[PDB]
């Protein structure tokens, strides 16, 4: 399942990933907690994203 961003997010460190509303991601690890390692389908950039900022694509 792909996920889509609900809101803009600005990373605080190197480890999380900034993204814009509507960006889509493939998820890499989601059982480490509620922050998921993801890859932007737009930029291929990877980083942790807050899972409460995304939803599964329709």
Binding site for Na ion (CB under 5 A): 51, 54
Contact predicate 30/36, CB 8 Å: yes
Task: Provide the minimum distance between the beta carbon of 6 and Na ion in the complex, in angstroms, as a whole number.
Answer: 8
Residue pair 2/25 in contact (Cβ under 8 Å)? The answer is yes
Residue closer to Na ion, measured from CB, 17 or 54: 54
φ and ψ at 12, to 5 degrees? -95, -30
Question: Between residues 14 and 56, which has the closer beta carbon with respect to Na ion?
Answer: 56
Comparing CB distances to Na ion, the nearer of 38 and 54 is: 54
């Amino acid at each position: 399942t792909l996920f889509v961003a609900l809101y803009d997010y600005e990373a605080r460190t190197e480890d999380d990933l900034s993204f814009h509303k509507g960006e889509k991601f493939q998820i890499l690890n989601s059982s480490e907690g509620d922050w998921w390692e993801a890859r932007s389908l737009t930029t291929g950039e990877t980083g942790y994203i807050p899972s409460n900022y995304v939803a599964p694509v329709d």
